[PDB]
Amino acid sequence: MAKVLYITAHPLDETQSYSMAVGKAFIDTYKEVNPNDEVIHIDLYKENIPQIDADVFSGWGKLQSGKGFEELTAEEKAKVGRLAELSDQFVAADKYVFVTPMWNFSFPPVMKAYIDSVAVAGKTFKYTGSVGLLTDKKALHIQASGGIFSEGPAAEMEMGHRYLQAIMNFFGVPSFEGLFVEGQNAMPDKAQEIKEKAIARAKDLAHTF
């Protein structure tokens, strides 16, 4: 039945991270409710997510100019092939769950490397400006932040959800939702309640996502 990419960008586990704990409650409940679904954890700190580098440009340039994958160097093939797998896996899925901590207003670097690995002309978008191809998908972003960024002055500083929002628009993903676990550092006295309330929200959302 449906394929769901549970995409995490956190080097810590659900015992040490508010985003991972919330995500964990979400995705556990999602599998409970949808036992038939293909739920794939993409762990961006365990998988190799190649940044686009000189080898990638050179490997791509070769393929572009008619060359065979055989003709790439070992490094070019390893990076290029990995990016192709990432790309293919993303298009093949039905639903996306991104889970991130807020670091300096946005997400860990590897979340940008993941987006770069799946943003591929002819797969997630096409030139026209551009139009998105992923017109039958859905996505959720679970984001943790020390202070409050969903409301108030700080909302103009929020840049991680804002970026993923732009990308979802770019890919033509028709349904996108934010679930924020926010304010636990600005209000340490309210940290457990903030967490638990976000968990309850996540488990409810998992019953219809």
Which of these segments, 17-25, 42-50, 68-76, 79-87, binds ligand FMN (CB under 6 A)? Answer: 17-25
Q: Site for ligand FMN (CB under 6 A): which residue of 140, 145, 179, 198?
A: 145
Binding partner at 115 among ligand FMN, a copy of itself, none, C-beta below 5 to 8 Å by kind: a copy of itself
Stretch that binds a copy of itself, among 67-75, 83-91, 133-141, 163-171 (CB under 8 A): 163-171
Site for ligand FMN in 97-116 (CB under 6 A): 101-105, 116
Report the residue number, 63 or 205, with the smaller CB distance to a copy of itself. 63
Measured from the CB atom, the residue of 187 and 205 that comes closer to a copy of itself is 187
Q: Does 51 bind a copy of itself (CB under 8 A)?
A: yes
Axis crossing angle, helix 74-92 with helix 109-118, rounded to the nearest 10: 80
Contact residues for a copy of itself, defined by CB under 8 A: 11-12, 45, 51-54, 56-57, 103-110, 112-113, 115-116, 119, 129, 147, 154, 157, 159, 162-163, 166-167, 169-170
Contact residues for ligand FMN, defined by CB under 6 A: 10, 17-20, 52, 101-105, 116, 144-147, 184-185
